[PDB]
Amino acid sequence: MKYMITSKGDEKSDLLRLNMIAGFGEYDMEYDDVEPEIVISIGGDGTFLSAFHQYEERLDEIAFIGIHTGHLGFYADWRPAEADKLVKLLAKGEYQKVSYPLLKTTVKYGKEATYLALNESTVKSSGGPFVVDVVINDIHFERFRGDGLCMSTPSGTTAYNKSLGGALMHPSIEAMQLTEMASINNRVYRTIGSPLVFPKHHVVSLQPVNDKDFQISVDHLSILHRDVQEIRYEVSAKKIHFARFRSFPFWRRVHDSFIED
Amino acid sequence: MKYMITSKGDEKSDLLRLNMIAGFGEYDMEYDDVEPEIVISIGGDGTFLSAFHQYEERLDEIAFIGIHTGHLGFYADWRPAEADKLVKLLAKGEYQKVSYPLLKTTVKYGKEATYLALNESTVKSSGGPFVVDVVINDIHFERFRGDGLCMSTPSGTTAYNKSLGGALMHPSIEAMQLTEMASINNRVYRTIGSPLVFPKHHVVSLQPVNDKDFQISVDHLSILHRDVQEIRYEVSAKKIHFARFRSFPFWRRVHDSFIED
Amino acid sequence: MKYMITSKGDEKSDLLRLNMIAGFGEYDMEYDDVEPEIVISIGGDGTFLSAFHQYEERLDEIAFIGIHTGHLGFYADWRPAEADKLVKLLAKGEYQKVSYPLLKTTVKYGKEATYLALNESTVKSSGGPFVVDVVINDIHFERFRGDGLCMSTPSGTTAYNKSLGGALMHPSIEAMQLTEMASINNRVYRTIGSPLVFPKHHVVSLQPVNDKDFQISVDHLSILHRDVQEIRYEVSAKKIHFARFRSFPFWRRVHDSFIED
Amino acid sequence: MKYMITSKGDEKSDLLRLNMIAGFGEYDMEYDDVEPEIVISIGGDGTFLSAFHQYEERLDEIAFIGIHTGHLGFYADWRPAEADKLVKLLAKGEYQKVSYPLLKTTVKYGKEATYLALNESTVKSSGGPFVVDVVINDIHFERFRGDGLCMSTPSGTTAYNKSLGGALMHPSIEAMQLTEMASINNRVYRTIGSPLVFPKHHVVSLQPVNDKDFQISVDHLSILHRDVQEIRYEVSAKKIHFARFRSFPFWRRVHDSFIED
Ligand SMILES: NCCNc1ncnc2c1ncn2[C@@H]1O[C@H](COCC#Cc2nc3c(N)ncnc3n2[C@@H]2O[C@H](CO)[C@@H](O)[C@H]2O)[C@@H](O)[C@H]1O
Ligand SMILES: NCCNc1ncnc2c1ncn2[C@@H]1O[C@H](COCC#Cc2nc3c(N)ncnc3n2[C@@H]2O[C@H](CO)[C@@H](O)[C@H]2O)[C@@H](O)[C@H]1O
Ligand SMILES: NCCNc1ncnc2c1ncn2[C@@H]1O[C@H](COCC#Cc2nc3c(N)ncnc3n2[C@@H]2O[C@H](CO)[C@@H](O)[C@H]2O)[C@@H](O)[C@H]1O
Ligand SMILES: NCCNc1ncnc2c1ncn2[C@@H]1O[C@H](COCC#Cc2nc3c(N)ncnc3n2[C@@H]2O[C@H](CO)[C@@H](O)[C@H]2O)[C@@H](O)[C@H]1O
């Protein structure tokens, strides 16, 4: 099929990219970065996140592959030594696909702007104090005040959700996880403290109380939104599709990254 | 249908039980605690847990109801003032049922003994140090050492999973959650630290390293097992069925219990 | 002696201020906000922090007083109903003084700029990733990467140190506490995780690795410092002096603020 | 002076002990385990804790030494390769001494029994639910309910206090730290959550509410006390004295044990 390859930009990733292109030149494979069918990321998870968001509008027609030229990643989880065997098996095709859930973020102004996240989306305050009303399925749940909130995808739970105390969820679970950032709790102010895991079709809505300006991040893109009326989180109907050529369990990927490898 | 009622034993729960029986006497309802179809628990979640385990072998033929004579519970979530309206609506029938997942615990000796848990099951050490090899889907994940482990159901996440830092999961998610109890982490000893959420059909196996005696709890029953070879956790194929007569969202039940009511 | 009074600015605090001035007019008390001897803060802890930093260069010649027109504060810990009894006892004098330790922050450029903090001082990253080398008494302790670090005074432990998992220290302990903000820990990256409590004369030094621009906060003043070479934390030789007219134990102040009042 | 040596019991520690005795035979050094002046522990921190409690009644006349035949310990912090240089420098004497604070535990019945702890002392429940009234300096602070409480010494903060979220305190700080074990917090039950650091002369008192039987641990000795009326914690007036022959900072000892060595 059609294919393209992104690279971290350093010398190791660029040269491995040119070697896979040359290996792809030995099959009916056409290099195309406009409407590709196979996107190969060479670098870390950050390079993979850039590859995802570069083609987020054709997710249902693309199978992603991750090659880590540095330490093992959760999305770039194949060694550079396996590039040649990767080229052939991708060349024949007939591979199976695995799908991970995505997080849809909707931001309303006083105008709507939606986003898709592979890791997570965070809300923080532009300078001053951060206070939100957290509304779950139109039911007011709590008035949060602290440094911010993080809504994570299943595969994003090992990223930044994890540093905030959140649990690690297997990516086959269609859900999203919300974690707190330095919440203040006293007799007057009250948050749940525990992380929350929401299923599909559950809508978590963040609504402002005083300041209406928020620093909103979606994966690695962070933009200050002004005059914000609402932030809506829910598990997306779209999914990201990986091409699998070997067996690499998520919990094994967790073991190698955090226990020892 | 046939029905029975358990009571916490105090005077308030016993008298409310006799008043519901008298109200049930005004319909074709037969009191039977051998093969009931409706089990009504009057008390707290502890009384409800006793009611569940009393009829754990007929779970697919029973719809449970919880009435809290004290503070609001997550299973006993209906006020005593709503007992009369409860008797009639249960009398007519035609109610809908909601189902929560359960945790199957398997304990092997050198002999097998399986259990069902509505909240969680915990493993701790009989006196000395607690060390386990944690095996996920036959893959060795970590060597845990500390005070113990807790494997929680979705509706058990607000119980004791919560005190151990675990996340709160909506009970519609067929999953189980594992939390650590005072794990020691240094250069020599390494645990994941984060809680783990496992989907259906995933098998978490605990295996001993030195001591083979463990204090194993399943909800509120705690028994010391000797000569233990393995402890297997997985989401059960059985589910507990509640009869619902009103709308009481889980997140609303979480709000009232931990934020304010 | 000479005295001045700051006010939160709202109508309740301004009018209580004019009533204490009128009550002070009935004694030999001279209102002076240039070289006062008694600084009375009317408002919350935020108003008290502004009062502290307004007179941080004459700390050894001032006894502070806090009056909370809203909820109880840890520095503004006297009810407005006790203002009249406060005016007289401050008028006679002969009060005893209590002293809390302070945190000295030193920031070096490529030039030095020192600060004093009553609550804490935090280091965060200007936009991009936050990586630091943490050096304790010239010994390299760890390479921190995450959202930031917080170095807290004893009386600042109930503030923002507390939201970050830190312990609450009695203000008689001459020490400082360091807490982490969303540290990432894997096989490759390693932080201590636990909060650290340092005694007097111990010097904690933060040193950059890549980015040399940091958002540095000292209590409520937050300023982006550019071209930063080092950030040095240590317990200050200066102390803040409170005038005490009653008995209000710190742990009682903790109980009323976080347990119930 | 007089000296004795304890050993972990394995072959490596026993033979290193006989080699130090033979090396001590080359000086005026008399082996005496009744009234020694130098206690040398060969093993881990556990062997050192046994050595401490073996001579807890002559602490002001003993300087302890720790040799780790396994991984580095916080009390056994000298390599076996440094045993010969250790024998000579201990033989000459003229060494300096460092002192760490200790925790005094007082247990009253309905009779008093006091203990000394080098790491910590914990209170847990004999089977059933664990509820305590926590009283600080005769002021009731909170009603704790959960799995237990841990009161730690400064040098015990890296032990088991650390697994419970507590902070690490430099051992020059005369203080004690209290951490919670799986506390339950809802609208009805309320604990501080944060760890508490108490100075000298502060008295933390645990008092029962229903069950009067508690599993009380002091370092590695754990005994079930029946008919308990009170448990009193406070920094002891006694201190443990180490002989120092090199420079080994506590924070360096923390770095090697938890970061990397
Ligand atoms: N207001 C607070 C400011 N703080 C932050 N602001 C914004 N983002 C943040 C913040 N603090 C962490 N992040 C995480 O960085 C990602 C940036 O994109 C690159 C990546 C990645 C990645 N993805 C995963 C994954 N899925 N699982 C496991 N490790 C993963 N990583 C690892 O993160 C490191 C690089 O970041 C490397 O070790 C990668 O191996 C964000 O998506 C977020 O997850
Ligand atoms: N080795 C460590 C020893 N420690 C422990 N050993 C054993 N069990 C423990 C331990 N520490 C907590 N527990 C929890 O007690 C349950 C006992 O059964 C009664 C109950 C309950 C209950 N269930 C829920 C729920 N589903 N959601 C939310 N609150 C719930 N509660 C509340 O718990 C309190 C009573 O316990 C009351 O406030 C109830 O409102 C166990 O199932 C376990 O969850
Ligand atoms: N990069 C992360 C961005 N996040 C933050 N950036 C900057 N500061 C922050 C941040 N998140 C919390 N803070 C804290 O706010 C203080 C601001 O000054 C006002 C105050 C106060 C105060 N002082 C105490 C005290 N000593 N003990 C107990 N409560 C106290 N408060 C209470 O804080 C609330 C107001 O803040 C009120 O409830 C007060 O009762 C800072 O000094 C810091 O402690
Ligand atoms: N109801 C709950 C049941 N749980 C527990 N019950 C009782 N004790 C417990 C429990 N869980 C941990 N402990 C700790 O074990 C100590 C036992 O004595 C041996 C030791 C030690 C030691 N001391 C230190 C130190 N000062 N600093 C840093 N590491 C240290 N260790 C390390 O602990 C490991 C051995 O334990 C080894 O890695 C040692 O390197 C107790 O004093 C307590 O600290």
Numbering used by the authors:
A (entry chain A), B (entry chain A), C (entry chain A), D (entry chain A): 1 to 110, 114 to 264
Paper's wording?
Nicotinamide adenine dinucleotide (NAD) kinases (NADK) are ubiquitous enzymes, which catalyze the phosphorylation of NAD to nicotinamide adenine dinucleotide phosphate (NADP), which is subsequently reduced to NADPH. Therefore, NADK represents a promising target for the development of novel antibiotics with an original mode of action. Here, we describe the synthesis of a series of functionalized diadenosine derivatives based on the chemical structure of NKI1.
The soaking procedure described previously for inhibitor 1 was used to obtain crystals of the target in complex with compounds 2-5. While compound 3 failed to yield complex with the crystallized target, compound 2 soaking led to a complex with the target. The structure showed a clear change in the orientation of the adenine moiety located in the subsite N (syn vs anti conformation), while that of the adenine moiety in the subsite A was maintained. However, the N6 spacer arm appears to prevent the usual orientation of the ligand in the subsite N due to van der Waals clashes with neighboring residues, especially Asp150 which is normally hydrogen bonded to the N6 atom. In all three cases, the spacer arms appeared flexible in the crystal structures (weak electron densities) suggesting they are perfectly amenable to column grafting. This finding is consistent with our previous work describing the affinity drop induced by the introduction of a N6-cyclopropylamino group on the adenosine residue located in the subsite N. Introduction of the spacer arm at the 5’-end of the diadenosine derivative (compound 4) resulted in a slightly reduced inhibitory potency as compared to that of inhibitor 1 (NKI1). In contrast, compound 2 showed a different orientation which could explain its increased inhibition constant.
